[PDB]
Amino acid sequence: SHMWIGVISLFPEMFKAITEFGVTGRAVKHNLLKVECWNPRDFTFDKHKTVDDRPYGGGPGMLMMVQPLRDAIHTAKAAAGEGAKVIYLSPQGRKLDQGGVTELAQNQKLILVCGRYEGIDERLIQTEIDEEWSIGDYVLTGGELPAMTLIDAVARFIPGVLSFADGLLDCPHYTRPEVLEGLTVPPVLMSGHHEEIRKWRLKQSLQRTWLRRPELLEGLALTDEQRKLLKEAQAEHNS
Amino acid sequence: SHMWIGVISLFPEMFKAITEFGVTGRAVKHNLLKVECWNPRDFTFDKHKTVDDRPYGGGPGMLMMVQPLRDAIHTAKAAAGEGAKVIYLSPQGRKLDQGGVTELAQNQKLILVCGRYEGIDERLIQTEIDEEWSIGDYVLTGGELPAMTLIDAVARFIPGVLSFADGLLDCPHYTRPEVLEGLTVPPVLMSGHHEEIRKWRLKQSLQRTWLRRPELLEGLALTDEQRKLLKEAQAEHNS
Numbered sequence: 001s002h003m004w005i006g007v008i009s010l011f012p013e014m015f016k017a018i019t020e021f022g023v024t025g026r027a028v029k030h031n032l033l034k035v036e037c038w039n040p041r042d043f044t045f046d047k048h049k050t051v052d053d054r055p056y057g058g059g060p061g062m063l064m065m066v067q068p069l070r071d072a073i074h075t076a077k078a079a080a081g082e083g084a085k086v087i088y089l090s091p092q093g094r095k096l097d098q099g100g101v102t103e104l105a106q107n108q109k110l111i112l113v114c115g116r117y118e119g120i121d122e123r124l125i126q127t128e129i130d131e132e133w134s135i136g137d138y139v140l141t142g143g144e145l146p147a148m149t150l151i152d153a154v155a156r157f158i159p160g161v162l163s164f165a166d167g168l169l170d171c172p173h174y175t176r177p178e179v180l181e182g183l184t185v186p187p188v189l190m191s192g193h194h195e196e197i198r199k200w201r202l203k204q205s206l207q208r209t210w211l212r213r214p215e216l217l218e219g220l221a222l223t224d225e226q227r228k229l230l231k232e233a234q235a236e237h238n239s
Numbered sequence: 240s241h242m243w244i245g246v247i248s249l250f251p252e253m254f255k256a257i258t259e260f261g262v263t264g265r266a267v268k269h270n271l272l273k274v275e276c277w278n279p280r281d282f283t284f285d286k287h288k289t290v291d292d293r294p295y296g297g298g299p300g301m302l303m304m305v306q307p308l309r310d311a312i313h314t315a316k317a318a319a320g321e322g323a324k325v326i327y328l329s330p331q332g333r334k335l336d337q338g339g340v341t342e343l344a345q346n347q348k349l350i351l352v353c354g355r356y357e358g359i360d361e362r363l364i365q366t367e368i369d370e371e372w373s374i375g376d377y378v379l380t381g382g383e384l385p386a387m388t389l390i391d392a393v394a395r396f397i398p399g400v401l402s403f404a405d406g407l408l409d410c411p412h413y414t415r416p417e418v419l420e421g422l423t424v425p426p427v428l429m430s431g432h433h434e435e436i437r438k439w440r441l442k443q444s445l446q447r448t449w450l451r452r453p454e455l456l457e458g459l460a461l462t463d464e465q466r467k468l469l470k471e472a473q474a475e476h477n478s
């Protein structure tokens with residue numbers, strides 16, 4: 001099932017990073033994912049194509065100019081037709097996580113508004129934006145990398161495109177050679193015992209989540225098997 | 240003060256998104272930031288330039304092939320000289336936040352290793368990586384967008400390149416026109432009263448943090464002024 005994502009950005013060429021390369025580049029080429037960009041600069045009318053403006057109240061920064069940005073959004077909305085969710089990427093938004101990604105991926109159409117400078121007029125958020133989303137508690141130079149991050153994450157859910165599946169960190173992975181700077185591959189992985197290997201990997205995920213991100217465990221209802229392997233991992237750690 | 244960032248990636252052209260555009264593009268052009276990429280594909284020797292390999296123990300995915308990736312890392316380390324911190328971008332890493340960004344930005348040299356497929360051999364993390372970092376609890380198709388995100392965030396700290404400064408969400412911002420779809424600019428911002436404007440903005444930040452991200456407040460030692468304005472905001476909310 002196709003996903004269409006409209007993008008509003010002063011730097012649309014940044015999105016070549018996801019539309020021209022890798023898994024996401026394939027998804028675009030195969031028409032599984034469509035990414036369409038509108039640049040507020042194209043909606044300006046003055047000679048110098050001005051896209052920023054001064055904040056009321058003063059301050060050292062600038063904001064996105066309202067008229068070109070508003071017009072770009074309206075154009076994207078018209079192209080989307082009915083049912084597109086309009087998202088503003090900002091640190092004031094809902095924190096993105098895999099559960100949030102799964103939710104966003106349920107939309108067939110999204111419009112992603114990328115801010116630059118000190119951001120956008122609050123009244124545009126009120127009148128034009130459906131949801132604000134943050135990719136993390138850090139400050140960037142613009143909304144483009146967050147938008148690309150969001151697109152990449154939701155793209156993985158599109159059929160044909162391709163251990164947080166159960167909320168745990170991933171297990172360690174090994175490939176050739178069998179010995180690397182004196183470090184050997186765990187023999188269980190060489191055993192060909194599919195069930196032993198499954199349980200080892202799950203136990204490692206549980207142990208790594210417990211040691212690195214114990215808060216993630218509290219959010220889970222562990223299966224009987226997971227409870228057992230976690231107990232074993234914690235016992236081995238204390239021995 | 241210059242920052243040098245070495246990048247190991249199968250898709251180095253993705254990094255044009257930050258080296259050719261905007262604030263980060265300027266930083267690169269002005270030699271404030273140098274980004275240098277090595278591609279494991281260039282370190283292969285077989286006819287088909289193979290960069291992936293099968294995981295021991297089976298499973299549906301592939302891993303980065305060790306030899307080309309290892310050789311690329313060693314080459315980057317040699318180019319960096321002494322004192323470069325080597326970072327692997329992964330969901331199993333330390334969660335990036337602004338405090339973490341400030342810490343990373345203290346390094347004059349960084350090497351960022353971007354994984355693809357199901358990631359990299361655990362023994363390479365042991366032997367080659369100094370720190371693992373995550374940009375958030377979501378799964379992407381590769382480490383490139385996280386690396387670019389990290390670069391963008393740390394770049395803001397480089398002198399000459401340019402409200403989490405005190406750990407709060409930002410205040411609303413307004414620009415022209417004075418009225419937008421019936422919504423007016425708060426009169427205080429039109430007053431020209433610099434101290435009233437400062438306090439209004441701070442109060443708004445406190446109110447927005449309290450309503451949207453109350454957990455962020457618990458991590459703060461509020462100033463007397465902040466305690467007062469937060470109390471006022473909470474009173475007005477309950478009235």
Ligand SMILES: c1cc(-c2cnc[nH]2)ccn1
Pocket residue numbers: 089090091115116133134135136137138139140141142143146
């Ligand atoms: C979403 C947006 C942003 C951001 C936009 N402009 C500066 N920072 C940061 C994180 N997640």
Ligand SMILES: c1cc(-c2cnc[nH]2)ccn1
Pocket residue numbers: 328329330354355372373374375376377378379380381382385
């Ligand atoms: C850092 C790396 C990753 C990632 C790398 N490969 C798949 N996901 C996700 C978030 N932060």
